[PDB]
Design a protein around this ligand. Structure first.
Ligand SMILES: Cc1ccnc2c1NC(=O)c1cccnc1N2C1CC1
Ligand SMILES: [Mg+2]
Lengths: 523, 394
């Protein structure tokens, strides 16, 4: 039998003492039956009138049957029970698996109910079964195995399973086993018959510990649907997504659609939700109907088309390098694909994250590269070689002018428009013969010129960018601009090419036009 | 074993483990698998909810991997234990030795081992991940050096009396051996130590040269309006520290709205002011001492071209030190610098400082272990340094 994990109640706290709520004589009987059987099988044990601890239990009817099922409410015990090692939080991504010839899934029945419980804790698992007679006291039991509904069950079960699987995994290094709650996925590259044979070996090995499973005739067959994917031993995809076909859309429908569309972008390239998402602006209710604009209609149509024919993800071949390729698919929009075999995606994706109010394509591209890097280490434990639409010269330039540090693993330029570039650069030294503008809601120039305007619905730093803006407008191709705004300075010094602020964008527009622009700061 | 406890009320750490590369993981397995065989660590069960992140760094001048356990959180939650050489920095040259293996020969209080739990993750969460805790004193833990102190004096006793010409300071897993002897007569007494130590440890600093980069003003042939403006702005910023700095006279050349590039001859009155301003900056401001009761802060600035700048203070502007580091890639450099500054900080004050790094947390968390080599890990946060500040240094 399996080792017993030492459980303890949270510090200071004491076991639960919840009175048992009333139960119909009917339910009382059904329970005495269920519990009497559990006591015969050793899962629970009649205890003495000494145990003060108690947990409420009630009966539930199971679909199809006159029979009732027992349910124990272990909330309080759960509150008073220690914290355990976090039951697996992270799940594998289909794209990190290596293909198998055969993959078999197995359900483990009698899961918890087949694993010993720490002897010192069993006294807290106490529950009482009310007797039908009024003068007679109801029977009290406690658990001897992991109880369903208890805090430490999920973790202690997995713990045990892993131990139980130790040998078998050792004797069979050619077989891969992923444990997920009560399921077990088992893949191998053995021949059909040999595979089925090994499965049976595993089945018996687990049963040697009282763990039951389904026989070949009863096992689910591929593709297996899991965590939103549709898995084959050789390929993977997201489970079939259907797009609504209607002329009345509510905010609810649009949000669900966009959500559904995002999910797909990890395998279906070309999916876009920019227009659908716009339909969400200013919405008043989840039930508000928003007419689809002409562009949203076109978008839905292309996605619908993209989704008509399925596409599959191939699995990770650990013998091959990982290649990552990024494309700019619109302002602030990027798309990336990760493959090993030239154009047989292990997976794809789209990054649209803008970090900070203002930014440029280089920063963004670089952040996209970091996001992908992190993602790969997680799925394949190694970083891909990148294929980028930026030239080394360009990157390097922006790199050494930026105050923040950053890295980019091995990467090769890929002449695939649109190539990312910098639309402008501030002179490093003031321009000779270029007029000089001194801004402070107006400006004054050395050439005698000036102008002042008033502004409403304006914030303090907003007027600051206004001055600079006006100056750009009124100046020639080359211009020197002097300001006391540390704020505006940074922004522009950052050489952004895109922004939330319209004002900034216009300034950028001006900036792109000029031949030479020198910006200076003064207290 | 010694009954250690966490600072009152405090519970154990539960730090998430930053994802690792297949390479580092394989190394950590080979290593922990081995520490298990030798009883230094043990697999733990679900009844342990604690966690400390583990990493794998490579040793310098060695092909072998080293397990770096980030006990930063645990060290903060540990109780305090109840002397830094005023002259370790004075010393001509100091060498650093890793005596971490000293601990792996001393037990850890049974009821404390739970707190040292750590995990070796698996690629793409395909397996549950290997969980262990320590049985011996773990490397990197605040308690190890402390608990091992006795046994450490009982062993440095002979060399200390035999060679009272060399100062020996310990800091966690490291040993700072300083002296003024010849570098050959040094590298020797050092190996004479590596021997007196094996009698019961792999690897010059020269804290003598560690200089305080003063603030500098441009020395120009001619001075344009722009030059003067950058000058005034910078000076003005520094007047915050050295209140004797005046610019009144410089601002006079800047009246009106001249052309940025217009060259300006400097008035007699003005040229005499700059010189005074220059003199004032030649040395660090007076009356700025190190308060042991305050955290040491360290800020870095990317100067560009593989050049960086740092300052170590406790209060703003009141700098205990300032430096510059120069050459790779941005990240490699920043990590090497952090360490260089941490060492110096240790050597001079005996405490690591708190860094303010100019880089995205994700980028750092990603590559920092590719070039880290120290046995300790300083505290750190990520910032967005302004332009003006960076311009006012180096
Ligand atoms: C859900 C899941 C999680 C992790 N790995 C796998 C699976 N399921 C599979 O169906 C699968 C498919 C192809 C290759 N490995 C797979 N398996 C591995 C076990 C053989
Ligand atoms: Mg002005």
């Amino acid at each position: 039998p399996i080792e017993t994990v030492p459980v303890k109640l949270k510090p200071g706290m004491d076991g639960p003492k919840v009175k048992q709520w009333p139960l119909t004589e009917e339910k009382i009987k059904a329970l005495v039956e269920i519990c009497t059987e559990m006591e015969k099988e050793g899962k629970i044990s009649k205890i003495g009138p000494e145990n003060p601890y108690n947990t409420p239990v009630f009966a539930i009817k199971k679909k199809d049957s006159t029979k009732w099922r027992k349910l124990v409410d272990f909330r309080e015990l759960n509150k008073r029970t220690q914290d355990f090692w976090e039951v697996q939080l992270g799940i594998p991504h289909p794209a990190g698996l290596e293909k198998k010839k055969s993959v078999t899934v197995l359900d483990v029945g009698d899961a918890y109910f087949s694993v010993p419980l720490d002897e010192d804790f069993r006294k807290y698992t106490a529950f009482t079964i009310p007797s039908i007679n009024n003068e007679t006291p109801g029977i009290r039991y406690q658990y001897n195995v992991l109880p369903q509904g208890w805090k430490g069950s999920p973790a202690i079960f997995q713990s045990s399973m892993t131990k139980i699987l130790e040998p078998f995994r050792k004797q069979n290094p050619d077989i891969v086993i992923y444990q997920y709650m009560d399921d077990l996925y088992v893949g191998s590259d053995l021949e059909i018959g040999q595979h089925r044979t090994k499965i049976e070996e595993l089945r018996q090995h687990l049963l040697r510990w009282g763990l039951t499973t389904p026989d070949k005739k009863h096992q689910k067959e591929p593709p297996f649907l899991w965590m939103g994917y549709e898995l084959h031993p050789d390929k993977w995809t997201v489970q079939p997504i259907v797009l609504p076909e209607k002329d009345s859309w509510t905010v609810n429908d649009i949000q669900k659609l966009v959500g559904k569309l995002n999910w797909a972008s990890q395998i279906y390239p070309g999916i876009k939700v920019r227009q659908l998402c716009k339909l969400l602006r200013g919405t008043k209710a989840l039930t508000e109907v928003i007419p689809l604009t002409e562009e949203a209609e076109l978008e839905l149509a292309e996605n619908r088309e993209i989704l008509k024919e399925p596409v599959h993800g191939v699995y990770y071949d650990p013998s091959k390098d990982l290649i990552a390729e990024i494309q700019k698919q619109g302002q602030g929009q990027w798309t990336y694909q990760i493959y090993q075999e030239p154009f047989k995606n292990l997976k794809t994706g789209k990054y649209a994250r803008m970090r900070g109010a203002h930014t440029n394509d280089v920063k963004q591209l670089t952040e996209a590269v970091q996001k992908i890097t992190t993602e790969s280490i997680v799925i394949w434990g190694k970083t891909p070689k990148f294929k980028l639409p930026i030239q080394k010269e360009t990157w390097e330039t922006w790199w050494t002018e930026y105050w923040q540090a950053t890295w980019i693993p091995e990467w090769e330029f890929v002449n695939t428009p649109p190539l990312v570039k910098l639309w402008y650069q501030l002179e490093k030294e003031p321009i000779v013969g270029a007029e000089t503008f001194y801004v402070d809601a107006g400006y004054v120039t050395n050439r005698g010129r000036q102008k002042v305007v008033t502004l409403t619905d304006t914030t303090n730093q907003k007027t600051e960018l206004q001055a600079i803006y006006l100056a750009l407008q009124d100046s020639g191709l080359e211009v020197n601009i002097v300001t006391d705004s540390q704020y505006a300075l940074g922004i522009i010094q950052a050489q952004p090419d895109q922004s939330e602020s319209e004002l900034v964008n216009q300034i950028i527009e001006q900036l792109i036009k000029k031949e030479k622009v020198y910006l200076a700061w003064v207290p | 074993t010694v009954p250690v406890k966490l600072k009152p009320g405090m519970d154990g750490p539960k730090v998430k483990q930053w994802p690792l590369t297949e390479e580092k993981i394989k190394a950590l397995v080979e290593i922990c698998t081995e520490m298990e065989k030798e009883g230094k660590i043990s697999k733990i069960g679900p009844e342990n909810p604690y966690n400390t992140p583990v990493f794998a760094i490579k040793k310098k001048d060695s092909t072998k991997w080293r397990k770096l356990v980030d006990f930063r959180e645990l060290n903060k939650r540990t109780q305090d234990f109840w002397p830094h050489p005023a002259g370790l920095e004075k010393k001509k040259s100091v060498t650093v030795l890793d005596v971490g293996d000293a601990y792996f020969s001393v037990p850890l209080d049974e009821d404390f081992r739970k707190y040292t739990a750590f995990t070796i993750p698996s690629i793409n969460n395909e397996t549950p991940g290997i969980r262990y805790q320590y049985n011996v004193l773990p490397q990197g833990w605040k308690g190890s050096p402390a608990i091992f102190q006795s046994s450490m004096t009982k062993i440095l006793e002979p060399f200390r009396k035999q060679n009272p010409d060399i100062v020996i300071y310990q800091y966690m897993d490291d040993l700072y051996v300083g002296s003024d002897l010849e570098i050959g007569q040094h590298r020797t007494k050092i190996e004479e130590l590596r021997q007196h130590l094996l009698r019961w440890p792999p690897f010059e600093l020269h804290p003598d040269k560690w200089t305080v980069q003063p603030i500098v003003l441009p020395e120009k042939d001619s001075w344009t309006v722009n030059d003067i403006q950058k000058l005034v702005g910078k000076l003005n910023w520094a007047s915050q520290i050295y209140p004797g700095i005046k610019v009144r006279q410089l601002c006079k050349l800047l009246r009106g709205t001249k052309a940025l590039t217009e060259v300006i001859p400097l008035t007699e009155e003005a040229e005499l002011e700059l010189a005074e301003n220059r003199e004032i900056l030649k040395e660090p401001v007076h009356g700025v001492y190190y308060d042991p009761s305050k955290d040491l802060i360290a800020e870095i600035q990317k100067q560009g071209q593989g050049q960086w700048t740092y300052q170590i203070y406790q209060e703003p502007f009141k700098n205990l030190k300032t430096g510059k580091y120069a050459r790779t890639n941005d990240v490699k450099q920043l990590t090497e610098a952090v360490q260089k500054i941490t060492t110096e900080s240790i050597v001079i004050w005996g405490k690591t400082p708190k860094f303010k790094l100019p880089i995205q947390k994700e980028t750092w968390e990603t590559w920092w272990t590719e070039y880290w080599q120290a046995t300790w890990i300083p505290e750190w946060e990520f910032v967005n340094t302004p332009p003006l500040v960076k311009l006012w240094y180096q």
